[PDB]
Structure formats: structure tokens, C-alpha cells
Symmetry: D3
Subunit: 157 residues, 6 copies
């Protein structure tokens, strides 16, 4: 089988945790669409797409695309049959169950798969990283270099 998978999120900004997950996905499926949600917001959609493209340029079977529809609607149109979700902690799990049962109702031919990040990134999030950086904390370790540079520029002005 030549599986097409979608890895959706806001990626605001994309972190080393996201890179970890999408890297694992590319080792599992023939084509991975890194789908950036237009809504919800430190970086614009065009900023978030460019940062994610640069940070995944080394992965040959990743396609970075923006989308504004319901995720399932975009997945259906893209002929994806696998929905990548990253699993960090118990707290996300309940919402992930809700979301996956809803997504299965909306598009039963799209199978949710949950990947586990490395221990290194199992306790971070885009939200926590932004909050720390906005309040003068060091987040260099959690971001690709291009994202780190864009984040510093964003927080300076």
C-alpha cells in the first residue's frame, strides 16, 4: 500500500516535538502532508507555512500545505487515509479520544494514528514555549534554528 497521511495542527510555531512526530510519520507512510490550520496566534499562516517548510525541507516525503476547512473535509479532499496525532500526556488523551471519534464519524475512511514523541519533547507545547519566550525565558532547545530566529524577531517588535 502507498498510504497518504495528514499531520494537521496550528504549528504556531512548529517545535522540535512536531519535527519528531512528523519524522516518525515519514518513516511509516509513503507521503505525509503537514497541514497547517489557517485559524487560531503569534505567527501568520504564511509565516507558519514558511517556517515548517524550512524545518522539514530535509524530509523528502513531507508536503507542507495550509488549509482552512474542517480538518476532516481537507483530509477527504487530499485522499488521506491516515490522520497523524502526537500523544504527549494523559491530559491531551481525553480530548484526543473525543476528536478521533468525531473525525471517525465525519470521515470513517480516515484512520487516526497516535504517535509518541521522544521523552525529550514529551512535556512541551507550542503554547508553553510561546508563553516562556514571551516572558523572557530561554526556549532555544525546543525549536528548530530557523524558528528560534523568527521567534526572537517576532518578540523584539
Amino acid at each position: 500500500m502507498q498510504k497518504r497521511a495528514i499531520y494537521p495542527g496550528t504549528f504556531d510555531p512548529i517545535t522540535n516535538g512536531h519535527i519528531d512526530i512528523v519524522t516518525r510519520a515519514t518513516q511509516m507512510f509513503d507521503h505525509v502532508i503537514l497541514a497547517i490550520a489557517a485559524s487560531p496566534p503569534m505567527f501568520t499562516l504564511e509565516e507558519r507555512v514558511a517556517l515548517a517548510q524550512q524545518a522539514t525541507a530535509h524530509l523528502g516525503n513531507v508536503e507542507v500545505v495550509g488549509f482552512s476547512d474542517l480538518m476532516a473535509n481537507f483530509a477527504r479532499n487530499q485522499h488521506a487515509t491516515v490522520l497523524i496525532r502526537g500523544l504527549r500526556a494523559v491530559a491531551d488523551f481525553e480530548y484526543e479520544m473525543q476528536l478521533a471519534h468525531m473525525n471517525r464519524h465525519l470521515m470513517p475512511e480516515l484512520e487516526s494514528v497516535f504517535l509518541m514523541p521522544s521523552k525529550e519533547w514529551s512535556f512541551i507545547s507550542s503554547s508553553l514555549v510561546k508563553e516562556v519566550a514571551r516572558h523572557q525565558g530561554d526556549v532555544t532547545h525546543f525549536l528548530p534554528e530557523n524558528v528560534h530566529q523568527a521567534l526572537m524577531a517576532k518578540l523584539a517588535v
Copy 2:
């Protein structure tokens, strides 16, 4: 005993999960007040009351009423001794424990009872249903027909 129970919520809108819970409550207690909170908001309070009355019209011992006070204050005034809460997942449980211990402090003669919805509705919520419908997803399966029609009208304008 002729128990009076209250089933409070925002019911914005009332879903098949709420219908499930209140139906179970009516099989257990002589009178069930479906109490619609005035605050927090897709449908107005008058819209939410009308939709809930229509969706529960077949249940002879349900009374749909709006309220704006602290839930416990309204329950006390209504001479309710049972407080119906619907239990979906672990994530709600911690807040439910908080809320029930607070409600027991405010009105010790009001006993919180937790009912379990059917597996069919154990992974939905008014919030998730609204979000999906607002973003062009199909939520017909989760709502009474009158609510489905009102929701489509609401999202069209």
C-alpha cells in the same frame, strides 16, 4: 419518596447526550427540572429553552425552566434534593468533584448524582458539536431534529 431533581446546564444547544441523561433521570425521579442557565453563546436563553422544551415534550415529568442565580441558589428555591450531573469522561470528573463538593458546601440537602450516557454520546459535547458545525461538519446524528434545523438556520446567517 417523591423526589424533585434538577438537571442544570447551559444546553447550547441541547444534544442527544442531554436527552439521554434527562431521560434516565425521569425514569429514576418523580419530577425533573431541566434548568437552563441564562449565562454563557450560540443560542439565546429563549432559544435554548424553546429547543429543550420541544426536544423533551415527550417526557411527562420534565419541566424546562431558565435560571440566572447560582445553581445551588435556584435548586434550593425549587426544593430540589437531587442534582443530576452527566458523566462522560475522566477529564470532566475532576471538575465534577470540585463542583459537587462546592455544591455540597452551599446546599448540603442537595445530593449530586452522576448518570452515565450511552456509549453513543460518551464522546460528544455541545462545544465540540458547535465547533464542528461552525466549520462545515455534519452533526445531524448528535442533535434532536428541531435542534438540527435551528442550528442550520443559525449558521446560515
Copy 3:
């Protein structure tokens, strides 16, 4: 007459169980405190001992009936003409197991409605297992057990 069943292993019955069954009697006309034989749990007290301890500890509640059973709980509930199934909800961890049991029981007997009650803060962190563990090491558990149960626990461990 609304009839509710409160099943459990009750090995032994604690003040947390007394809390839950008391709340149940304020809500329903008749409450059957149903003690499961639970051989797989290797209970410290025999079923006969646990029934006697619960009968004594609930004698002050006029609408409680203590019965032992080895049947399928759902069959025992139907045979007791119960339409309400009482379970106490203490912590996040048992909530998940309670939902499994309740969905299974609903498959076995859909007209038996599971209801969960919340114990007082006083008993929200104890369990039969924890009290037994403290007592095995001679720690004071008078605060967590009815008087007759405490005596019996002391005697059993002596």
C-alpha cells in the same frame, strides 16, 4: 417503592461505604447493600463475616437490607427488583473501571440504571485495602471504621 442496590466486596465495610449507603437511603425508598463473595480477591473476611459486620454497621438505617451474593451482580439486581445501581466515586482512577462495569451491567440489564454518589471529603482518600494495610502494621484505623468492624478487624489480625 424505588429499590436500589449498592453492591461491593465490603472487605470490610468502611465509614466511606457507610457514607454512600446513607446518602442512598436519603434518595431511595429501599436500599439493598449487596456483598459479593468475590473469591478472586481472596477476601480477608468470609462472606458470612462481611454480611454480619455490614448488618451491625447499618442497623441504624431502617431501609437498608444487607444480603450476600455469588451470582452475576446484574442477575442478583434483577432478582431483587432493583432499578438503581449505587456506586461510590472516590478517585479518578476507579472512575474508568466504574464506567466499564456500568456499561457491561447496562448490557446485561438495561433497566438497571447506574448512579454514582460522591463520598464526603473525610472518606475520599481511604479504601478497604488501605485500612487493612495500615491495620496489618498495627496503625490506628479507629477513625475509618464502624466500631463493630474495628473490633472485628483487630480480632482477626490478632
Copy 4:
């Protein structure tokens, strides 16, 4: 050819397990349903019995291979040339244990990628243990098991 392994004790295999392995076969070219001997769990069925039950229950799935093992799971996965490790995610409580196992397995075999699938709502509240418990008390578990497994469970308990 992408090869995935779905390991577990499968004592016995339930409709929830059939759900997960079916989803796996729609995603990966070949799925090894790997049954751990699990002596520490004192399984109701022998490994041979559990393999035979799973073979019959998955015969309709052309790309499932049922094998028993007593090895370290990670070594068995490497020796099956698997690069995907399937686990089903039912409730919040096992999620934590699943992460421990997956992080350990990643230490043992980093190229074996753990993936978690979510069963249908129908089977999200059952388990081999719960079905066995109901059946020990003669409750009807036909709905939760493949036909051959139900027969075998009835026979074993008779």
C-alpha cells in the same frame, strides 16, 4: 512491504482486539498478531489455545499472521522484521502504562515505531478480564467475542 506487529496476551481475543487488528490490516501490508505467553498473568487459556482461537477468529483477514512467543517482545519484533508496533488505546488508565512500554520498547528497538489505534465506541469499555469475569458468573458475553472464542470460553468454564 510494511510489516506491523500487534502483541498482547489475548486471553482470550475479544471483538475489541478484532477491531484493532482489522484497522491495522487496512493500514499495513502484513500484520503479525503476536500472542505473549505471559505466565506471570496466569492466563485462563494456554498459549496454544490462544493462538488457535486467534487464528480462527482472524482467518477472514488475509494479511494477518498469528504467532505465539515467549521472547522479549522487542526481540520478537526485530526477528519478525516488523517496523510498526500496534497497540490499542481504550481508556485513560492504560495510556500511562502503554507509554512506559513504548518508551522501553523504543530503548530496546528504536526502529520499531509504536502506533496506537482507537477501537470503536462499541468495544471501548470491555477487556479480556471483564469478559472473563462476567462469564465466570454465567452472564451473556456473546456480543463481545468471536463465535469460536465464545464457544471455547463456555466450554472452558463448563
Copy 5:
């Protein structure tokens, strides 16, 4: 060792749960800084500092101070080596793990310690107390007397 510990929070307002935690901390460490975050808001920072000072005046090794930097940045500057966190329920625990691993990245010489409040305060929060009081519920039992008086005055106007 003569340990300096920091107990940070918004304390809006300080509750009997906070008093419980800080009292336990003072029995464990030589000096406890009760650090009040300037950001996020019923009482102003100056109101929250004054209420906390009055409510902890009986504790001789407590110092109430406001701060506006990243907590770890303030802890570093204060030469704190212990970070007091109060642990109520499972729901907070996941965020507490996130926060503590981030704080350990930001300042590894600051050790997070988790204290457990009494059962009496294990189901309350500043947020729940404010919400109940704003909606005409009795919260006298959860607050120091000075905080109760200030809260009534605040809600009257």
C-alpha cells in the same frame, strides 16, 4: 542547610488552601518567599500583596513580594533553590509536570517540591471561589477573614 524557597502564584485572592500550603512550607524551609505574580484579575497586585501579607503576618519566616518576570527568572535572582507547588487533584498534575520540567530546563538549581493541602481545601481554587462569590454563593469558609471582607467590598461595587 538554610534553604530559601519560593511559593509563586497569582493569589487572586489568597485562599485558606494557599495559607495551608505556605504554612507547611514554613515548617520545612528556613525562609519562604510568597511571590505574587503581577500578571493575570479581581484584585490589583497591590491589593493581592496587602491581603497576603495580612493573612501570613503570623508566619515569621514568610516574605510577601510581587514579581513580574518569568517565575524562574525571579527565583534565580532571589537565590531560591526550592520551588513550592501545591498539589490538589489529578487534573493539575499534568500541567504541573509540564511546568516543572520547563522550570528545571530554565533553572536546574531550582528544585520543584509538591506539597499536599489538607482534605478541607483539596477541592477549591481561587477561580472557583471567585465564580461562586460573584454569583451570590457563600465562600466565607474558604478565605481568611481579611480576604472575605475585601471580597465582599469588591463585589459590592
Copy 6:
């Protein structure tokens, strides 16, 4: 002199336990690593073996004292003149049990203050049980155990 007790079964002591006790020694003047006999858990190593393994594994920490006990933990803590009770907090699931134990211990000895420390991310997904399970199947657990403990575990299983 602030005295803290770090009780546990330590069967065997892991790098996660070493992490927690090290953090404790940086916070308190004297730390008693207290090994519970825990017969109900059927430990792999005797109490004497577990004390010897922990003594060797903590010899580099000058303010750690390793002692075995079969008493009620709270009584042992009082008799060690401890006023701080160290527990490590790994996952969501044990958090609930830890609160039960801590509230019970506070009832038994209110001046013993429970404190929870968080291990490094490196050890946040292991346990004595998991390491033993991997080792029973000959998987490599060198990374998770002190050298003397790894040797002893290999020898015991051989």
C-alpha cells in the same frame, strides 16, 4: 538538622530512585532511604538483599542512610525523627495512590510532611516492575540500574 525519609519497596532500586534520593540530599541535611519489607508484594529480592544493593548504590551520597523496616512506615518515620516524607511522582496514575498514602500518613503522624519530587525525564517512564519484566526476558536494562544492582539482577535471574 532536617531529617527526611524516602520509603519504598526498592525491589530493586533503580536509577529513578537514585535520582529522587539525590534530589532529596540536595534539599535536606540527612535522608533515610527506608526499605519496606513488603511481603504482600512477593519481592524478588529479600529485604537484606535490597538494603545491601541500596547501600552500595548510594555510598557516594554522604548524607544517605539505608535502613530496612517492617513497621508501620509512619511509626518508623517518627522513630527516625523524620519530619519530611519523600515520594517520587512519575505518572498520573500513581499520583492518586500517593495522595491516599499521604493523607493516611498525615492522619497517623501529622508532623511528618509529605513532599513529592519529580524525577528527570530520563527515568519518568520506568519502574522496578518494568525493569524486572524486561530482564526476565533477557532484555538489556543496564541503562536503568546502578552497576551493582544490574549485576545482582543478572545473577538472580541466571
